[PDB]
Amino acid sequence: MESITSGFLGPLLVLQAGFFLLTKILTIPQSLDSWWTSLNPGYRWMCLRRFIIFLFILLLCLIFLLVLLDYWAFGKFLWEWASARFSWLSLLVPFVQWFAGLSPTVWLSVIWMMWYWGPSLYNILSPFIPLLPIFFCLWVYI
Amino acid sequence: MESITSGFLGPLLVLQAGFFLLTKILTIPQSLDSWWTSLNPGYRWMCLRRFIIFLFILLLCLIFLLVLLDYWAFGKFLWEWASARFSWLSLLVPFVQWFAGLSPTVWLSVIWMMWYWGPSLYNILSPFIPLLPIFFCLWVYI
């Protein structure tokens, strides 16, 4: 008796597991709405936002599953798009190397600045945008 | 020399267009943050949300890169990754095949259907959510 009756059970558990994955997929929009939707006829806008988050859940799973499916050719195909872009990125690497040799002291200094100076850089970026045309004027003068 | 001031002038208008492209990209995270706000220390939360939405913009550009990845062998590579899924997917293929012929003609009608289906499916989903685990348990019994 016990082996057959416990055999039936799990089969409802498989049904429960389907209900748990469905409800978990809907609760992810609810937890995301608490953080994102608080920082930002209501039924359609809730349902569109639930569906857009279901597309984001699907997109994260699709990216994970596609990269798991490749597990070097994808890196090398990205590098073929880089056969042009590397022209530029090959100049960036040497700058990144130099930054890696000085990174300990500079990275901890830049982290401390990113807290005080990061809000300053939001304000200072408003002057950087007008300075970018003045730089051009300097590039044309030079 | 007037000509050198013209020719160099160009770079300056193109450099301004490069700042206009960068600021228009930043308007995509801000306008999605506005749209999310319309459905729903604040400086810190705004900066955190805009950082995460900008990372999501790079993931969305990678999904657009999969559309560009066609520009049948792209579809066939997905069909091989499918081949593991395909034991399950091969039951879906007969359904999708019937849908794939009709739906494009039906699609002009589907635009009208989607308006009336939106309220209908909300009501129908309330009893269908309990029935779908009941029907799943029948699928285990057979």
Automatic annotation (TrEMBL), chains A, B:
InterPro entries in the record: HBV_HBSAG
GO CC entries: viral envelope; virion membrane
Keywords: Caveolin-mediated endocytosis of virus by host, Fusion of virus membrane with host endosomal membrane, Fusion of virus membrane with host membrane, Glycoprotein, Host-virus interaction, Lipoprotein, Membrane, Myristate, Transmembrane, Transmembrane helix, Viral attachment to host cell, Viral envelope protein, Viral penetration into host cytoplasm, Virion, Virus endocytosis by host, Virus entry into host cell
Pfam families, sorted: vMSA (PF00695)
Membrane-crossing segments per the record: 51-69, 86-115, 121-141
Keyword Transmembrane helix: yes
Compartments where found: Virion membrane
Example GO biological process: caveolin-mediated endocytosis of virus by host cell
Protein known as: SAg protein
Species in which this protein is naturally found: hepatitis B virus genotype E
Taxonomic path: Viruses, Riboviria, Pararnavirae, Artverviricota, Revtraviricetes
